[PDB]
Structures are given as C-alpha cells and as structure tokens.
Amino acid sequence: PRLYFENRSKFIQDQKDKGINPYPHKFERTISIPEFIEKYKDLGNGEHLEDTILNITGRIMRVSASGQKLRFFDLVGDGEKIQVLANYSFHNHEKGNFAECYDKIRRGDIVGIVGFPGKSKKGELSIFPKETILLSACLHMLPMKYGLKDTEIRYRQRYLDLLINESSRHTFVTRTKIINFLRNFLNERGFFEVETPMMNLIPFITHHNDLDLDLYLRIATELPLKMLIVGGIDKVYEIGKVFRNEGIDNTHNPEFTSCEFYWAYADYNDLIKWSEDFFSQLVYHLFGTYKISYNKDGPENQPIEIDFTPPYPKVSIVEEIEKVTNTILEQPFDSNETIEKMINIIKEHKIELPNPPTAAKLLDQLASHFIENKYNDKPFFIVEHPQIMSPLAKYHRTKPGLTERLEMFICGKEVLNAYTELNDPFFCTSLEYGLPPTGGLGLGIDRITMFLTNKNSIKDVILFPTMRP
Amino acid sequence: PRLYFENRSKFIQDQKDKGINPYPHKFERTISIPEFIEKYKDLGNGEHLEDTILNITGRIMRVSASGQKLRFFDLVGDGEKIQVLANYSFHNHEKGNFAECYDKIRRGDIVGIVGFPGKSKKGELSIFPKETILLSACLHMLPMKYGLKDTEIRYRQRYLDLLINESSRHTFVTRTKIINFLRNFLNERGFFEVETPMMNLIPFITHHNDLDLDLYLRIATELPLKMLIVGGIDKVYEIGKVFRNEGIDNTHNPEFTSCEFYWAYADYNDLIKWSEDFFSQLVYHLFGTYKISYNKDGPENQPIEIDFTPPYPKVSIVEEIEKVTNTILEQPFDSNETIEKMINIIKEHKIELPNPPTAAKLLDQLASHFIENKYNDKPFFIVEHPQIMSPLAKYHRTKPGLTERLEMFICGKEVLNAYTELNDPFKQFCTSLEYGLPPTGGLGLGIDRITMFLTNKNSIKDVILFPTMRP
C-alpha cells in the first residue's frame, strides 16, 4: 500500500536508468476512444482491420492475462471504454519483449498504443497493439467502486471520483448542460450578460491592504444590476458566484451559483410565462420528456415523479392560509391584533418555532407549514406575498398590503424568486434618476441541478465543495 | 441644484394629491426603439402613418418648444435615439391639458408614449404622441457630455456613463461579444466549462466563522483544473474572476477576469495554432478585417495599426538576447557566473532595476528591455523560456534549461501564456500528480487586457463596469 508506492517509485527510477522515459514528451493520437467506438462498434465479431493503423491513448482500468501470448486490458478515456487485446503474434519484438513490456503495466497507467481495430470472438470491441508505451504512471493503488461511495474522498479527491464512478462524471456534465442551456435561453430572448463586483461594502469580510478598507463578498447581484437598467440596458443578467458565511452541511456551501436578470417593462404574467417556459424547456431538453424521478427521501427510499408540464399552479399565500386555517386576516395591516391571530395559529395548530415574533417571520412559518409542501407531484408558485415579507417589490395593483411577488417551488424547496421592482424612491441615488417598471428574477442553480441529477446533497453537484479537514 | 431636486420631489408629491401615479404600475409597449427605427427608417420625409397607433417607452434626453402648439423631445432606448414631436393638433384633450402635460416633462424622465410613426418634413424619424405619461422621473439634473469625461463619476456612477456616452455602452457590449466568442470557440472545439472554488486554503484573507478558519481568495484556476484532467475530463476551461490584494490604479483592479484551459496530449504547435486561430478569428469576428487601430500612448497622441493576420513571429528569448546584447548565455546552469553575465549587461547596458537580484528576476527584466517591445505592428510570441522562470512547465525536448512555453504580446503587454505541464512527480495537488497526469498543455488569458486592445482603451476602468474606487 505505502509499499506499492515506493515500489512504483523505484520502478520509475529504474526505467530512467534502463534508458526509458516513463513520462515522454508527446505521443501523437489519431483518435479518441469515443471516436474509435462510434466507428468500429458496428464492426462484426472476430473482424479485424489489419490495414488500419491507429494511435490511441487512455487509462488502464483492468488488467488480466491469458498465457503470455495473450494479455487483456480495459482502456478508458472521456468516460468511454474499449478493450486492449495484446497478442504475442502482433507484438513488434524489435522494440522489446512481449511479456517484459506488458507485466510492467498497472491499473491506472496512462498508455499510448499503436495498433489496429477489431472485435474479438465474443463481440467485444478492441484495439490490437503492435506497441504500447507508458505515457504517465499511476504511483498509487487506484481503489474500486465500493472503495469509495460512500466515502469522504469523493469530495477531497474528485479526480478519483471522476475516473472510477461513471455516474458522477455524468452528473457534472448535466450541470454544465444546464447552465449552457440557461445562458442561451436568455441570449435568445435578447438578454445581456454582465459581470459585477464579487467584492463590496455592505457576510464575508476581507481587507484590502493598500486602501486599509474592509471589503464585502457579495450575497447577491441585484443592486449593480438594477443600476445597469437605469443605465438603460433593458434586459441584463449575471450567472456567477455568491457567498454565505454560515454552517457547512449537505445543503450548505460557502459559495453558491446564482443567476439574476432584470427585465424593463416586464410585469407578472411575463415572469411566470418565463419561469414556465424555462423549466418545461430545460427538462425536456435534458430528458426528452417533462417527467422525472427524484429521490425526495434519499436513495434508501423510493423515487417520486415530478411533472414539469406547463402551466403550473399559482397559490396566493394569504388567500390559501385564510382558507385552510379558517380564520381571517386580510386586514392589510399585519401587526398587533393580526400578530395575535397568527401567533394563536402557531400553537393552536400543531406547532412550530415562533422565532423572534415578527409578522413577516410568522407569515413565513405559516406558508412553510401549510403551503410549501402542498405539491410534490409538480412544481408550483406561491404568489402575491404581503409587502411586509417583501420590502423591495412594487405594490399590488388591486390588493392592499400585498405585492405581485412569485416564488417557484419543487419538493418544498425554493427554486425561483421574482417580482416587479418598487421604483418610487418615496444605489438609492440611482433610483432617483429614474428606474422604469421592471421585473427581477433569481434562480437557485445548484438546487435545480440537484433535482435534475437526482441528488440530495449539494456536495454531489459542486466539484470541489468546501470541506473541514 | 439641490433645489431642482427639492422641486421635483415637490412636483412628485403634488401629482399624487392631484390624483396621478407618477410611478404607475404597468405601461404596455407595442415596440422597442431599436425596432421602431429598423421598421420606419425607410420612410419618406414628411410621411405620416396616422392610422398606426403604437405604444412606446424611453428616456427623455432633450427638450425644446416651438410656440406651444409644438414641443420636441429626444427619446433614447437600448442605446438608440428617436425624435418626439408633440403637436397640439394630435393631442387627445380628454386626458389633460396639452400645455400642462408637456411642461412637467424634464430631461432624464422615463415616459410612456402613445402615438404614431412618421418622419418630419426634414425626414427626421419621429414618434407623434396623442398621449404621453410619466413612468419614472429624473429627480436630479442630468449632466451632458462635457459633464463627464474626464470624471470619476464615469465609474462611481456607471449609469450616467451608459446613458450619455454611447461609445461606452458600445464598449461593454463588445466585452460581452468577446467572452461569448471565446466561450463559443472552446465549445466548438470540444472543451468542457466548469466551476472551481474562489475560496480555498493556501492574497485576500477572509475568516470563516463557523469553522473558525481563515479562507483565501483564489489567484488562478490552474490547480483544480489540472486535477480535473487526472479525473479524465480531457479538455477543460473556466471563465471567471481572480483576485490580487495589491494596489489599485488604471492598470489594476482587485478583481480580474481570466479564462484558463487545459488540453490533454496537446503540444506547443497545438497551443500556437490555437492562439493564432483564436486572435485572428476573434478580430475578424468583431471588425471585418485583421487590422485594427490602437491608441498606445493615449487619445492625446497618435494611434497605431496592429495586424492580427497569422501567422505571427516566434522569438526565442535567450537566443534574441544573445543576438542583441551580443553576449552568450545559457550554459544550462542559469546560476552564479551566468547571473553575473546578465547583471553586467544590466549595468553596462542602459540600466534597469535589478530588484532583489534573482536569476529569474534578472531574466524577466532583460526580456522587458530587449524583447517585449520589439513588435507593436502585430502580436508576437516570446518563446522557449528558462525552466527557472517557469517552474511548472515541462522541459524542452532538446534545449537544456529551456521549456516549450509560449507567451503572447500585443504592444508590449502580456496577453496569452501557455505551456505543456510538467507531469513527472519527481521533477517537481502534488498528490494527484502521482495518480498520473497525462501530457498536457495549459493556457491562460487576460480578458480585460484583451478587451482594452479591442475597445481601444488604455485604462482597465474603461473596460470593467464597476471599477473598485476609493469610497
């Protein structure tokens, strides 16, 4: 184990002395494995193309022998596999001894191979080397599936994870496939991508040494973005990192990825139509249907189905709480007496942490309880939140005490938040130069990716999650 | 001035009790100003489309009057401009006084307009309102050109800049066009974009409360990118923010934007052609040729012509020094007396800051004097660097002391920097290398610096929407 190492190290020195470079400078490929597969998969069993000479590379993942006239390797690259069939009859002996060269090879080794394509007798697609040259050696024991999963080194050595586990590589592709989708989605709808400062002055604190000033890592991207709208970029967005300095767990990472866009002269039906479009067209683009399975209770429980077929419910938060709790407060002052009702509900009905007793805090727990877990079979919108809960959203045309806010929910997890902005000052300076009627919108990216890759931890959607040593 | 503001506020509280909402809820536009021009730009001077009723919104950038049946305005939207022509004849009197309405309107006001297309007699493209509403008001005196440039309020208030200076918004669109093009270029070549931490443990420091632990802000993306290569993602990049906790000025911001990719089984030739394909194609994508104008010494001075037509010159650094300084140094132990030979040059030749006189430091200096400013009529590659300056590149095949690094220069500024990685754990994360890192080529970019050359700027603050500015 540590012995495996020193022996490989010793081995590497001995090939340097024997006059070999175990880390040569360049081996020139002809083909990647995925290209080799598409071309020769449709070959026939036993078939050889002896007139085809190919230079290929990859990592050795299995090795096995069969008489020292015969040698077998699994070779991987780009998350696709083929077989190395080393036959003594084809081995160019002018370069070296058949068995002396092939007993050198170990699981993990990156090799260059020069040979021809073919299937074996059983129908297993293969490269037949005339020559095999080490490109880079694996000095450690490469572990096995079971070895990891479930282990913490999936995260501390994600490279091992990407090699051994076929499914984690697929997860990370999907996340990129999702982001590209999003970006192109906006771009088609005339939006405009921009970067704004990570660092500010409004909670992660860092010190700019020169300026002797404390700097502030962004929690959001709203403000610079709203200000660009004043600047007269009517459609603008940022896909980027934000930060929370809190606890670290399986739902909690120091840097999340957010997207936020602003949309001048865009109202409520507009934002909804967008959110409904985005998700129906994302999910379809990934899976070919609007229907997917998600393990809400983990892998040790069942999957449930989620129908991203539009349109989706819209649930007014106060209407649906009056309805169910069967008291009334539409009373668009939600304080004093109306605090008592809500407080009385919290204890009367089952329970829940009061928290510091703010009506907006009360309100949240009551939608958390009675609404957020309404629909699991589909994504839906909680809607027309009170002003008290939402200090930045323009007033509801008709309904007093109320906004035109929209949140999107999937399995009781928030995913999309949006509203038409409160443009009447009566950054706070920018607002005085005129901000037109505007719709803003923030997506949770990692969470969305958790759904579409069917993960229950965020570490499983972020390549290098932050980990206590 | 702060009274204008007092009057506008006053005006605003006055519309409310007059029974208006001067920040209404929804106006519903039929058309955008770019759409309006595109559509009606091929009209005939004088031609009116009175039947055709459009809605539209826009900021007011200008106001005149003409005897009070007439009122004129400039409206701007999405970096485009049109003329407002408010004629009493067409005014719809049900809604309010023609006079009373168009007198509230100030410069910097966002308005809904209902009206029809038509060119004037002069053939100036116009919107002719029958009704005009206030959406949101400029409560402040909106400055003009002259007003800003050359001011810090181009930065500390980037909206004003975006509105008034059409040549600034031109510029930040071009930033975006470039990064889109880069993104598209890697993608079309089978590269895979990814995201790595901005915070780590290895110079901006920030405490993490609940771990009672100091985190650090990333300076490059190279390390976790290489790891991804060992994980068998073979073509990989990130486009994103790196940081320096160093001094701020017109070359320096705490937040830069870099793109870095690794590419497996890629050599020097591969890296070179990459770079010459990219620059040549980027420039042709933006401008229509390979020839662009840059103002190296500023707008106050003359411009130069830079030709991005490939191929470009490859200048082997040590070689060119030996050829210019007419001394001979390599002697692939670049230390002791080799240092001296360089120091004497540094002394004998003009001079130059030694710095703490390190060999690699001495070598960097030499290159800035004798090479880096050789070409200004085209981009060229400084090439085959010492291992001593480049501790992370593979050795040259045949030339001792050297590497197969390439580093690109436009007008003596560093723009691109690539090299095949040193994969042998015994000539040097240091873990992962021991799992086998295939032969590989890495490459980094200065997005900002590149946007500068292509947006003809000399200041980084003219290419980053919100430069970090003394508070």
XYZ file of N, CA and C in Angstrom, chain B residues 51-52 93 104 116 135 155 167 174 179 215 229 231 269 312 329 342-343 367 385 436 439 455:
69
model
N -52.962 56.345 -39.039
C -53.742 55.157 -38.700
C -53.032 54.307 -37.650
N -51.704 54.269 -37.730
C -50.916 53.291 -36.977
C -50.605 53.761 -35.553
N -57.298 65.657 -25.877
C -57.614 66.578 -24.782
C -58.410 65.986 -23.609
N -44.362 69.372 -17.410
C -43.775 68.645 -16.302
C -42.512 67.939 -16.822
N -48.095 57.755 -33.009
C -47.914 57.097 -34.285
C -46.599 57.449 -34.929
N -43.653 57.630 -16.463
C -43.365 56.326 -15.846
C -42.453 56.437 -14.611
N -17.257 56.233 -13.373
C -17.053 54.968 -12.686
C -17.985 54.852 -11.494
N -20.433 55.631 -26.662
C -19.184 54.965 -27.001
C -18.691 54.142 -25.827
N -19.188 45.009 -26.528
C -18.019 44.372 -27.118
C -17.279 43.451 -26.131
N -16.204 37.630 -24.847
C -16.391 36.480 -23.972
C -17.382 35.475 -24.566
N -10.091 31.485 5.249
C -10.125 31.111 3.837
C -9.377 32.134 2.996
N -8.161 17.069 -15.074
C -7.548 16.335 -16.172
C -7.203 14.916 -15.702
N -8.737 13.390 -13.489
C -10.041 12.763 -13.356
C -10.590 12.364 -14.704
N 2.976 23.302 -30.723
C 2.329 23.521 -32.011
C 0.824 23.634 -31.831
N 2.108 34.619 -36.719
C 2.857 35.661 -36.028
C 4.297 35.185 -35.691
N 24.732 33.509 -23.304
C 24.365 32.876 -22.048
C 23.263 31.836 -22.162
N 24.552 38.463 -16.846
C 23.284 39.162 -17.033
C 23.307 40.495 -16.297
N 23.832 40.474 -15.074
C 23.978 41.680 -14.264
C 24.864 42.710 -14.956
N 14.120 40.623 -20.646
C 13.071 40.435 -21.641
C 12.220 41.695 -21.863
N 11.098 29.622 -22.857
C 11.635 30.220 -21.635
C 12.483 29.266 -20.811
N -1.139 10.112 -11.977
C -0.813 10.125 -13.389
C -1.496 11.278 -14.073
N 0.438 13.791 -20.496
C 0.997 15.004 -21.107
C -0.150 15.996 -21.363
N -11.338 47.324 -27.438
C -12.177 48.508 -27.249
C -11.343 49.802 -27.201
